[PDB]
């Protein structure tokens, strides 16, 4: 259950964009998605939700993609940026978290473009 624009466009991205960034890493060699590996429950660990302004991890994004919370990956992506935003908010600066998250949204679109070319030719 995904629908939105094209069922694959979102579902496809579910596994494509979601995976690409979570498999993604930073110049150091480790996951840029590391800090966005898992988003608590938005209720279970409110501290995280208290600290953050717009929490949402790669997991929650895919979660919303199929949940019909996006209907368009551009929205997912916006959350992917928010994913990166929670990075600068939750973790500590001077740490890979900030440069990594920035890279995440970057990988995301790189994966978004190749994705479209893969769903055509």
């Amino acid at each position: 259950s995904t629908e939105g624009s094209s069922p694959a466009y979102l579902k496809e991205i579910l596994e494509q964009l979601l995976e690409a960034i979570v498999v993604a890493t930073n110049p150091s060699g480790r996951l840029i998605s590391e800090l966005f590996q898992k988003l608590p429950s938005k209720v279970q660990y409110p501290d995280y939700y208290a600290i953050i302004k717009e929490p949402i991890d790669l997991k929650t994004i895919a979660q919303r993609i199929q949940n019909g919370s996006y209907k368009s990956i551009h929205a997912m992506a916006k959350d992917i940026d928010l994913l990166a935003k929670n990075a600068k908010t939750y973790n500590e600066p001077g740490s890979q978290v900030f440069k990594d998250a920035n890279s995440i949204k970057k990988i995301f679109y790189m994966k978004k473009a190749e994705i479209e070319h893969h769903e055509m030719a």
């Binding site: 930073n26 060699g29 480790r30 590391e34 800090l35 590996q37 973790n91 740490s95 890979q96 990594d100």
Partner: peptide, 20 residues
Amino acid sequence: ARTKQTARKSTGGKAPRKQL
């Protein structure tokens, strides 16, 4: 990803570049 309890490596951080 988890079929049971236990199995959890946190301790400190996790962000890249972290090495000792």
